[PDB]
Every structure is written in C-alpha cells, then in structure tokens.
Amino acid sequence: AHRTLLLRLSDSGEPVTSCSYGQGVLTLPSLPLPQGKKLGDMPVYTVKLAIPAGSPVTRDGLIWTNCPPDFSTQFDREKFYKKIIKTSFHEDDHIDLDIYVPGTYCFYLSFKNDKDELETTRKFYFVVLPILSVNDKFIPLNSIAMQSVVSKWMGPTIKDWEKVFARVASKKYNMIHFTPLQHRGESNSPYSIYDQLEFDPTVFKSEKEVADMVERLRTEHNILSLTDIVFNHTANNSQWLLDHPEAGYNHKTSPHLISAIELDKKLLDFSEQMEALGYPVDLKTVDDLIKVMDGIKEHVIGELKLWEFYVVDVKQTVSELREKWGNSKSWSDDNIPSKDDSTNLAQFVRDNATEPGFGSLGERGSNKINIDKFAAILKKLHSEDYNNGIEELATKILNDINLPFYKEYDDDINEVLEQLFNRIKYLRIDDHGPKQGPITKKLPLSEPYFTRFKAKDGEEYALANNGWIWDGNPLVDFASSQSKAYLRREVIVWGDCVKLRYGKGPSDSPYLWERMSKYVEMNARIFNGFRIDNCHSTPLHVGQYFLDVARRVNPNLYVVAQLFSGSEAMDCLFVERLGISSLIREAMQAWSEEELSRLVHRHGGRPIGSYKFVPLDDFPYPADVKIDEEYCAYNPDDHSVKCVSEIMIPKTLTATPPHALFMDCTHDNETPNQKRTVEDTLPNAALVAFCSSAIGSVYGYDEVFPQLLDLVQEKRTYSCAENTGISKVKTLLNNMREEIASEAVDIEDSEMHVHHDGQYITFHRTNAKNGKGWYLVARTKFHSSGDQMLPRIKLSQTKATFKAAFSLERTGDAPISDEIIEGIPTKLRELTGFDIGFDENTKETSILLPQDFPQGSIVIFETQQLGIDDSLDHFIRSGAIKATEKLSLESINYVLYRAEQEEYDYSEGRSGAYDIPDYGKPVYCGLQGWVSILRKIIFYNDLAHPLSNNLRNGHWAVDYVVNRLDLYKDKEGVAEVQEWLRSRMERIKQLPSYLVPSFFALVVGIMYGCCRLRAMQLMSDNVGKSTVFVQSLAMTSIQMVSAMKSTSILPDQNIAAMAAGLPHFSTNYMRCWGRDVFISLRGLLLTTGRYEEAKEHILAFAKTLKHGLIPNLLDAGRNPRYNARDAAWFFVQAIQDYVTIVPGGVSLLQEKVTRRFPLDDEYIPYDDPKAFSYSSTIEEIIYEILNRHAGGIKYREANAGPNLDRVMKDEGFNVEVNVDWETGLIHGGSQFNCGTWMDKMGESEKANSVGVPGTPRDGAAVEINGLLKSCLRFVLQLSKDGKFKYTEVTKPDGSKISLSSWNDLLQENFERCFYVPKNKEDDNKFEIDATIINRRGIYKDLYRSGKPYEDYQFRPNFTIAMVVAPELFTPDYAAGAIELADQVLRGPVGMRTLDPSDYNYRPYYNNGEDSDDFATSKGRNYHQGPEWVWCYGYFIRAYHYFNFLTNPKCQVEGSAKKLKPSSYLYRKLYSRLLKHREWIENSPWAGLAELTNKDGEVCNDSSPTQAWSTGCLLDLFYDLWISYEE
Ligand SMILES: OC[C@H]1O[C@H](O[C@H]2[C@H](O)[C@@H](O)[C@@H](O[C@H]3[C@H](O)[C@@H](O)[C@@H](O[C@H]4[C@H](O)[C@@H](O)[C@@H](O[C@H]5[C@H](O)[C@@H](O)[C@@H](O)O[C@@H]5CO)O[C@@H]4CO)O[C@@H]3CO)O[C@@H]2CO)[C@H](O)[C@@H](O)[C@@H]1O
Ligand SMILES: OC[C@H]1O[C@H](O[C@H]2[C@H](O)[C@@H](O)[C@@H](O[C@H]3[C@H](O)[C@@H](O)[C@@H](O[C@H]4[C@H](O)[C@@H](O)[C@@H](O[C@H]5[C@H](O)[C@@H](O)[C@@H](O)O[C@@H]5CO)O[C@@H]4CO)O[C@@H]3CO)O[C@@H]2CO)[C@H](O)[C@@H](O)[C@@H]1O
Ligand SMILES: OC[C@H]1O[C@H](O[C@H]2[C@H](O)[C@@H](O)[C@@H](O[C@H]3[C@H](O)[C@@H](O)[C@@H](O[C@H]4[C@H](O)[C@@H](O)[C@@H](O)O[C@@H]4CO)O[C@@H]3CO)O[C@@H]2CO)[C@H](O)[C@@H](O)[C@@H]1O
Ligand SMILES: OC[C@H]1O[C@H](O[C@H]2[C@H](O)[C@@H](O)[C@@H](O[C@H]3[C@H](O)[C@@H](O)[C@@H](O)O[C@@H]3CO)O[C@@H]2CO)[C@H](O)[C@@H](O)[C@@H]1O
C-alpha cells in the first residue's frame, strides 16, 4: 500500500521545503515494511520528483541519480542513471525514484543553457533509514535505548559478560554499544587497535564466537548491538605497519613533515642528555621551568641551524654564482625593476629565477635559486663582470627575498615554544590536571609525535600518530601539507595510535583501503550498526566509501556519529552523504540548569499546538488526481505514508534536522558525582528520557559510579550488584517510552513544553494527534543550593494522574576494591503529597508539590488534553469531498472569494469581512482570504501571529467562517459545505484554547483544496492538467463570475454576471462593462470550459444594442450608456471565439433574444410595452452592427447633461462613426470623447483639465479596424456554410457593397494607412509626415485622429489587430514592430501605455492628486505610461505568432514533419511570464493587477485583481494548447 512521497523541485532543480523546520536533511519516514513484505519484494519508498513546466531545467532535461533501477543492482555511489524529463509548457513532469533498500542517494539535473551549452545542477541527497527490528518487533528510531559497555570491565569469560548483559536487559535497554572488541594495542586502549581483522584473544577465539554472542543478546534479551569503528588510526605496535609503512604519514608520503620529524627525534634525544645538564628532572615553579625552556632553545632549536627548511642559503647561492658566473649569458627582456625598487625586484627574482617548490616546506635545504637565471638577471641589470659588486648586489636581493621566509620561521618557532611552555606546565604541574611523573624511558617532556621503527623492507620510517587540535577547523587533515601542526607542536597527541593516510581514493594507500574494507565488512555482518568515533575528522570520501561497503553487507545498518563539525549546516552535509542515522548528544555537557533546560528543549519536539501542514494554493490540483473518498485508504498493517487529506497529493518530503541520540552520560563524561552530585543522576536521566529522540547511557551511570573510568589504566570488572541506583527508574522510563513508541511517526506529531525555574525543570511531553501527555517535574542537584519552592503548576483543559515519584539520596561513600568497581550507596525512596486539583469550571488542573521534595527528585504525571481522542484526527480529514460534490463554478465563488463589498451587497450592509485584531481584514470574506494569510503562518509555525492570537483569544473566527454562508445558503451545494464546516468547527471548539489555531488552519485548508480540486474538475482539461500558474489564473474566473443582489446582465433576473475587477468594479452600476466582458470572455469562460456561461453573457448584451453598437456600462440591460465605440467589435470577436471553440457553437447565431430597445435609436423607454416588444437572432445582430456602421452612425447620447455624465462637455456628448470607403476603415468620435478603452475624462480643477479627456482616440483606432477585419473574415467564411445569410451593406448615399469587397478593401489599405517604414524612402507608399513622427518600424496607434502626432505614438494596441486578424500584416514588418514593443513598451508585468521617450510620458497613476499638473492631476495619466496587464496578453500572443513565422530558430521539425515552436522560443515566452507567476503567488488576492506603475511598482489605485489581466494571459496558454498539443 501507499508508500510514496513528493519532492517538488524548483525552476533550478533545487528541492522545495514545505515547512521551515530549520537546517535539515531529506530523511524519509522511519516506518516498518508493510505487513509480510521482506526487503526487495518492493519499493521501500518512492520519491516522486515534480519538475515545473517550462522551467529552464526541462530544456534537454535529464535527471541523473544513483538509486539503482532494481533490487538486484547493487549501489555504487558513482554510477548514475538517466531519466528523460517530458517538457510541456502546460504540464509539470513527474519522475519516480524507487528505493528498494535503505541508504543514501543523490540526484542532479543536466540540461541546456541559453548559451546552448550543457549545464549541471548540484547533487541533492536524501536518506533512507534502516528498519531496526529485534524479533517481530519494530524499533522506531526514537525508541532506541542504548547502553554503552566497555569490553574490558566485564571480566574474562563470555559467561561473565552475559551477566552484564542481563543487568542492562532488566532496565529495558534495547541496544548495547560495545567499545571496540578487537586485539588491543600496546597501550591497551580500546581505541588503539593492534589488528582490526582479529577479535580480542582474551575473550574470543573466532569471529563466530562473537557473532554467536551478539545473536544471544538478540534472542535472549531483545537487544541489538553496535560497535565502535575506528577509521583514523591503528595502534603503534601493529605488525602490518612493518609490512606496509606506506599506510601512514612518513618521509615518502608526507614529506613536508620532514622538518617536524627531525624536531621530534631531537626532543626525546634531549630529555635523555638534559639529565647531564641543567636541573630540570622534576620541577614545581614557572621560573625554574623557564630554566628548561632556554635549555631547549640551545640544544634543539639552535642545533638545527636557523632553519634551512624555509630560507635560501645566501652564502651557498652566492659562491655557486661565482663558479657558474658567465653561463646563462644575459637576460634579454625588459622585465626587471631597477635596483632602486629593492622589493619589487626581489619579488621578480622569486617568480622568474627559482627552482620549483619555492615557498614550500619539505626538505632540509630545498628552497633554491636557479643560479643560471639569477646570473642572467644580474648581468642584464647591473654588470656583465661579476666583480662590480655583484657578490654584494646578489646578497642584498637574496636577503630581501628571505625577509618573509624569516618572519615565517619566527612566527612558527614562537608558537612551538608557547605550545611547549603550555604542555610541560600542564603535564608536569597541577593546573587542572597534575601528573608530575619526572622523566623515564616512557615519560619524556615531548610526547612522541611519530612512531619509529625499522620496516620489513629494511629501512627506518616514522609514521605520524594521530591526535586533535584545540581550536582548529576539524575538516582539514592536520597531517596534510595544508597544516604545519606537527611542526608548530599544535597537536594533542595519542602516542598510543598512528594516523592513517587514506588518499584521494584507494590508489594512494591501497593496502590500507583493503584492510579497512576487510574490517568494516567483518563487523557489519555481526552487528546491527556502528558508532563512528570522531567522524568530523574522517574525510567525507573515506567515510562514504566504507559505510557504503558495510551497508552492502548489511542493508539495515544503523550508524551513530559523534560529530561536531563547524556548523549545523555541515553536520547536515555529513549526515546527508554518509547516511548517518543518528547524531549523539551529551547532557553532561550542560554547565548550569538553564544550559540543560535548553539542550532538552532542542531535543524535545515541536511547540504545543504548532501549525499543521496542508496543501493550500501553491499546488496543482489535477482534475484527475485520486481521491480517498472518506479517508479510508491507509490500513495500519500496510504502514502507508499518508496524505494529509481525502485528495491524494502525497506526503511532502522536506528537510527535517538530523536524528538525535541523547546520552544522559557518555563513557568520556565526568560523572554527576564529579560534575554535579550523585543525586542529579535521577532528574538529569529523566529529563533526557522525556525527550522525543533516542537515548542512551554508559554503564555505571544508572549504577551511580563515582569517578569516570579511565579507558586505559582501568583494571577491574563491573560489580554484579543488581538493581543499584537508578535501575528501577530506567526500567520505568524505558518501558514507558515503549508504550509511546507505536504512536508518533513524523516531526509534526510529538509536541512539548519545557520550563526552567531555579533548580526545577518542567517537561510536558504531549502527543498532537490524541492528547496523551506526560508531565515531569525534575528538581535538579547541580549544587547543594538550599530550599526552593516551585509555584502552583497550572495545566489547561487537561487532566492529571500521579504515575510515580522518587528521590535519590546519598547513603554514604563508594566502597574501595582493587578488583571490582562499585557504586555509591543510594536510597531511591518513593514520594507523595502531590495535590492534583481540577477546577470543573475553568477546566484547569493545578499541581502542588509537597515540601518534601528534595533536590534530586522526580514526579511523573500522565496527562490528557480535554477535547481530543483518537477519533478527532480522522473526522477532520474527511467528507470535505462529499460536501463539495454539489458545487458549481458559481457557487465556488461564494465559498471562497467575495470581496468585502461583494459581501455587503448580499447582506444589505450588515455583514462583510472579519477584522483580525492587530492585522486588519482579509480580502475575500471566503476561504481564499484566510488561506492567503495562513500559508506563510503554517510555513513558519508562527503561533505569535495576530490571527494565531485571536484564534485562541476566542472562537469568533471559527464561527464567522460558518455563519457567512447563511448569506449564500441556497446557492448550489453551499449548504452542504457549510454543514461540513459547522461539524468540524463545532468539534474544534471543544478543544483547549491553545489547539484552535492549528485545527482551524487545517479545517480551512482542507475545504479550500477540495473546493479548488472541484474547480479544476469542472473546467476543461487544458486547465485541469496544467501547472499551478495556470490554474491560479483559471480561478481568477471564479473570482469574477458570481450572482449579485444589486446587479446582473438580464434586468428581470439576477444571475451570474462577470465583474471587470475586484473590488472597485464589483457592485451596483459598475460591475459589468461590455468592453471588459468580451475581452475577458475567451480567456476566463472559453479557455476554461464555461461555454454555457459565455453564451449567457453574449445573449444578455445582445439585447442592449442601439446606435448599431453595444454599450459600455450595462445596468443589467436597463438604462445602459453608449459612450463606447470599442465594445461592439470586442463583442463580435467574442461571438467568433465562441463559434470557433464551443462545440457546434454556430447554433448561437440562431438564438433569439428580446431586443430591449427599438430599431431606430429611439429614446429610453425603460419598461413600456416597447421593451419586451420584438426579437433578434444573434445572426441579424452581427449584421445589424456592420450595416449600421456602413451607412454611418450619428447620435446625441440618450439623456445627456450633468446628470448622466458630470464632466463631459456639451460638444462631446453627441458622437459619430463613419466608414471611409476609400480605405474601408472605421473613423469616429471627437476630441472631447473616449470611445476607446483609454478613457480617462479629465476632472481636476487646480490643473485645469475638466471635460478635456487625456486620450481621445478618434478616427481610425487600430484595434477596432483589426477587429472589423476579423469580423468580415468570419461572416464570409460563415456565408460559405449556410450559417450567415448576408452580403449586404447600404452606404450613407444609398449605394451597396459586398461584405466580401469590404474585406478585400481593408486587406490592401490597412497596413498602408497604419505602417511607418524603417527606410525613409518607402514613405511614399504609406501616407505620412516626417516631422510629425517619433520612431519607425511602428504600426501607428491611430490613423487621422484629432491631433497629428497622436497617430505616430508607439502604443501597445496594434497588438490586438495583430492577434485577431494577422492577414493584414506583412510578417517581416510586424515582427520588427512587435520586437520594438518587447524592448520599449513591455514592462515587467504590464505593457507601457505610452512610449517612455514621449514628452507626456508620466508613468505614475495617482488618482488622488489635487495638483496644478495638467498631466498628473486626478489621474489624467491612466493611459499614458502606466503598465496595463491585459495589454501584455495581446503583446505576448502576438510576439509568439510572429516570432514563429519570421524567425528560423524559433521553429523546429514537429510531430508529422510539420512545424512546432523550438525550445528557444518557449524559453523566451516563459521568461516573459515569470513576473506574472510571482505576482500571483504574492498577491493577497489570487490574481494579477489591473495596472502597474513605472517598471512594476505597485499602483495603489489599481484594482488588485482585474478580469481581463488574466483572461488575456489565458488566451496565450490556449493558443499554444490548441495550436500544438497533439
Ligand atoms: O594551545 C592549545 C591549547 O593548549 C593549552 O591548553 C591546555 C589546556 O589548558 C589543558 O587543560 C588541556 O585540555 C585538557 C582539558 O583540561 C580536559 O578537560 C580535557 O579536554 C576536554 C576539553 O576541555 C573540552 O573543551 C573538549 O574539547 C573539544 C572541543 O571543544 C571541540 O570543539 C572538539 O574539537 O572536540 C574536543 C574534544 O574532542 O573535550 C576535551 C576532552 O576530549 O582533556 C584535555 C587534554 O588533557 O589542553 C591543553 C594542553 O594539552 C593552551 O594554554 C590553551 O590556549 C589551548 O587550550
Ligand atoms: O446611476 C448611474 C450613475 O450615473 C452617473 O455615472 C457616471 C459617472 O459619474 C461619470 O463620471 C461618468 O463616468 C466615467 C468617468 O468620467 C471616466 O473618467 C471613466 O471612469 C474611470 C475613472 O476615471 C478611473 O479613474 C478609474 O477609477 C477607479 C480607480 O482606478 C480606483 O482606484 C478606484 O478609485 O475606483 C475607481 C472605479 O470605481 O476607472 C473608471 C472606469 O473605468 O469612465 C466612466 C464611465 O465610462 O459616467 C458615468 C455613467 O453612468 C452618475 O454620475 C453616478 O453617480 C450614478 O450612480
Ligand atoms: O604507549 C604508551 C603511551 O603512553 C602515553 O599516551 C597516553 C596519553 O598521554 C593519554 O592522553 C591517553 O589517551 C587516551 C584518551 O585520554 C582517551 O580519552 C581515549 O580517547 C579516544 C576517544 O575516546 C575517542 O572519542 C577518539 O578521540 O579516539 C581516542 C583514541 O585515541 O583514548 C586515548 C588513547 O588511549 O592514553 C594514552 C595511551 O596510554 C604517551 O603519551 C605515549 O607516547 C606512549 O606511547
Ligand atoms: O511640450 C509638450 C509638446 O507636446 C506635443 O508634441 C509631441 C510631439 O509631436 C511628439 O512626436 C513627441 O516628440 C518626440 C519627437 O517627435 C521625436 O522626433 C523626438 O525628437 O523625441 C520627441 C520626444 O517627445 O512629443 C510630444 C508629445 O508628448 C505638442 O505638439 C507640442 O506643441 C508641445 O510643446
């Protein structure tokens, strides 16, 4: 059953995090395998990659990964495997990587540049954890309890070990970590290994004997077993080092050390003969150690000769100049700085006349001049004859060259001295650690830094032995030639053990890499896992290759690291690549009480009432995605990784931080006896145990041992003394955690609260699904620090239960035995007097501690939050699908959207939108409003948000959500949605205040997704199966199309009517504009499948016609206004678009409507007998337009004067349109008029612009005539098929033209009248004036308008003509124009309404301005540089069409040897839509704006969601879809 999760990639192929859980790693769920299935029967998991559509990374895209294809193909980390990415511009690709076996896995993408070179992404790793299991018992990785045992304090039979096993076993540890149990070195450290291939002889003969022992623990005590593995060193005494001295760092491999080796041999040479000189045998004073210090300087620094290791031997160089003088002739070049530049020159000699390896460390005297090249320089520079003070001048240069080399040697040797001051004064004088043993064979001053021996190959050698460095970047091998640590004495040295030089790979040390392979394999097949000692100082590549080896031998290997690299950032990288399962943490490192309350809070779990992830509005809802109809898919034995909802988007795969294994105390930790008090052994151990994480403990901690046990010098066995110290209490803690084990799986599940108060720590450990808590009061004994009274503890809507209490008390001191290691004497006495008090009216629990509660104590309560059971979880995640089942694309508006005024309109003034205290109102009353706010909130777990606050401050939002819908209750399927939301909301309100933010988020998020999946399902497939960006655009339809009370499109009914934009054009006499509806209709209604709707709109506006054209503003068709020339044509174009797209849509034409105005252009009878009086087929309405225009229109706007328009001058009101029969084109309007969409009628007083419009667009508007062309074309093509029945047009004289002629008329005259050619000579043919011009290569915005130059302005309107009727345009001419637009008119999200070069380019729309600026005052600007967004939609459609005809490299050989666009062109289209993708992600409303200000700046007056802004971008998608997608 279902075991997939979904890893969204970005545009750059980077993974996408679903939640901020902070610096993490992509680890997959630690579940067991589904019931029955063994490893390799099936994918363990499957990571779905989801690549976004049209992203750069999909251009010759490819996904490379090293997950093997099948269960048989071994993993090799280097072998990759290809997967082709399917490009769509609409449709995101998805690629499944099946994982068959656990480990670590990367993938990258290869793809093609915009240089057409081949680029790679980084690698992106992800981990699959082992299934730890003991019998038929799955051990989740948070129920590990690991007891570190040291092999050599368990006594000499495997029998006496089985007792130590029994004792841990009874405290219910399930994992034992052994420190290595191999043949030990000479020092007898378990970390100093004599032979990694053989197990300790004292105990085991064979490996069988150890594997069988470990297999006892498994069956005998239910215990899994780790080993320490040691990668960085073997022991001084190993006699494979005789046989392979190359494995370490010596004269041959690491030659830089040659200086450091000589220093070391000449320091144990000293302590020998130091006896015969000065008085430093044994000392106790800083001013008779300074006596040894100068004794050093003389006999060892001095005796290795001013350090020929750094510096040039000037005396040698010079006298070999005198002998080889006269040999490299001269130096011919000009490259020598004059002798005056003492420095510049010496730097020149360094570069040009030195032997390779200059400025190195290595050999005794290996920093050499090229004598002969030097001579040359000197000859050229000074004199050919040596005897003109060359000997001199050569020494000067040579010395200047040695100046940084000598300061290098001095910096180095001061740091040698100070390092030897501070480790003879630590090793031989008490500071923190006295150890005053004077000199020996085996106790000199200098720690042996190198191990010294004659090899089997006969030669002497000296391998560097390993250590650590106080404040060093740990990732930088200090034995490498990068660092001088062995020479500078910066190493803290385990003379015990020898450092192992792995290489770049096995080539550099091949014998080594084989032993370590033989070693790692051997342990891997015995043990369930490893503990990697000192991981951060083991080069990644080494760690990776050897863990891979093991994990080949044992797929379910468990790996635990001691790892502090520099950053969390790094520790993630190591975990990533090595497949580390667990990072180790130490409680004993906490200095104070607070330092511990903090550690505990890192490894606690998430806040109480933390937000829960849902997919919201940044996902694609495939119309065809699975549904889990009442959340019943997941079957408990199948171990299915579950989706959040009914709708089956998978569980996202996000970075979570690496898994922690918290040690109450490690085997390198000073004991609570030492660092605090034995009494703290309890509360410290409980605190840790109460974390949500694995835990462990060293043997003896629970047993209350006194001193940390020295790994080397210790001799004895562990006591057989059963049930000592804390045993009873771990048994309880471990058995308790086991009960919890089953339940909490994922990071979101176990929440918590931690509180430090003085010496008390308080740890609430909740489960977030079901409400079970555990509460712990731990009173620490950091010190014996007196009497403190913790205050009345208060829980909310919670119940409490005493579970246990204890106090650890010191009975006296530790016994003292030569051959047995024992505990401190300790009582563990049970406690009482804890007063639990539940207030039946607050529902508050108060907890009072008795005064008998000595530091060193615990009380555990079990808790249970009130209002949560197992039941809740499911009920919240179900039936949201069946609620929405009755929704329409109208009714979805009501549930989701509804701008505030849209909601005052339904509620006659009293309802509106919810004011969140200290935030303000959301934007839609409906769910979108909330989702827009919640999303960032869920992402950041912001429980501080004003919404988060108000949501527990009370339940008012909860109820607002369910009560809004009273208004829209009768609308289809809203009722049922509301009732889903009431039931879930009702139930939520039975929760503790503090859980209501979390659950309200989820309850909304769920119904929002259901609601949105329901939208894609009812819309067309082209929308249904596309990208987010597109659905997002598509939904904007559902914002705009809803029914009202104050308005409609039919006048007797109120139905679904399309608004121009929210919230400025949504209500009363202002929602519908003929212009806006019909520019939108294709995008929002047709592209999307809402054909039935489109029809209702077309027919509803049809009714309105008069003056042979269609009205601007439509009062649901009753007293509309005809100040609009634009409209009729945009209308007719939609009629075409409909007949084209709708199946059998031709039949629209025969559809009758009530004409609700008479056939002459008679005055307004609103509701006479003369309204529903006579009818009209859409057929004879199209005709009606063409014919009326043909024969001239002329009219004084019905009902003129201040009333119908407050600003229109008297002159303007009466309007004209007349067809110039010389060209066939429509001229009209006047200089006091705005028939076009660029219709600001200037209003300001102080700037003097009243009744004087800013963009009259009289005469031949470009769009209008392009639209006329389209219309003629279409009706002709229709005449041809019986559907239109007209060729008829009477002209204002009486004469009659074939519609077919009119078509042929424009077809020749249009481009002529409108084009402005690039070449000044072609002007003849194209009708113009040179001095009244701006640019060229334009198609002008107007022909013969009221003012000369307003024709010749570059403006984004011609693009409309180019889309609707491209036959008018000679390809190459248009492609040049549309390309200038792209560099000049195209803003980042909208199209500049005027050429920036122009004198009256003022690109900031400020509709408030009361100024004396004729341009800017009261928004005259609107259409003069402001960047409109529907304009981009025409621009981009057009830009694609003509780059696909015109340009060769925009095309390619498609399906069926016919042409389709190339990746190159899509790339350019995609790029010009990124700022729209982003705009819509980050609008608080779904959509794109009306209108932007100069270069993308947000225009505060712009309606922030416009209808046509997205309708026109939907068009483009539909083109690419219909045009090329089969
Ligand atoms: O110049 C370098 C160094 O030398 C001199 O300091 C000496 C110290 O004063 C001396 O005590 C000795 O350190 C002891 C130490 O007393 C003892 O506690 C234990 O060391 C602890 C460290 O105290 C502790 O910080 C921790 O170290 C971490 C380290 O912080 C972490 O970043 C990472 O690198 O891992 C380290 C541990 O692996 O744990 C260690 C024990 O593991 O043992 C030490 C050795 O006996 O060290 C110096 C003499 O050798 C200079 O005076 C001083 O400027 C510098 O500290
Ligand atoms: O009872 C019916 C109704 O009749 C009369 O209405 C008339 C208007 O009062 C009258 O001014 C005229 O309207 C024209 C207007 O002159 C013209 O400028 C244009 O309107 C533009 C705005 O100028 C423009 O700024 C923009 O306004 C947005 C603004 O960007 C936004 O920030 C926010 O403030 O909202 C505004 C929209 O509400 O866009 C509009 C329209 O696109 O076009 C108008 C008509 O074409 O003609 C009206 C005809 O009915 C009465 O005066 C009125 O009181 C009565 O209710
Ligand atoms: O051959 C006899 C040698 O005697 C001397 O060496 C001593 C050192 O001076 C001590 O410092 C000590 O080193 C221990 C170390 O104290 C202990 O913590 C442990 O460290 C592990 C550690 O647990 C692990 O996390 C990782 O860091 O690896 C370490 C293993 O190195 O073990 C250290 C080594 O035993 O003991 C040594 C050995 O007695 C003297 O300096 C030598 O020159 C001399 O040869
Ligand atoms: O001061 C306002 C100014 O506006 C009107 O002139 C217009 C020009 O006709 C128009 O072409 C444009 O001028 C550009 C030139 O044509 C072009 O050759 C090049 O030189 O750049 C000019 C930059 O504007 O500018 C204005 C419209 O904004 C009006 O007719 C003038 O009388 C009036 O003085």
Author numbering: 3 to 1528
Please quote the authors directly.
The last residue on the branch is subsequently removed by its GC activity. The structures revealed that CgGDE is composed of four domains, and adopts an elongated structure.
For the complex structure a GT-defective mutant (E564Q, see below) was used to protect maltopentaose from being converted to other oligosaccharides. The maltopentaose complex structure revealed additional bound oligosaccharides. Our maltopentaose complex structure revealed highly specific substrate selectivity for the GT and GC active sites, which enables the GT active site to select glycogen phosphorylase-digested glycogen that contains four-residue branches, and the GC active site to select the GT reaction product that has a single-residue branch.
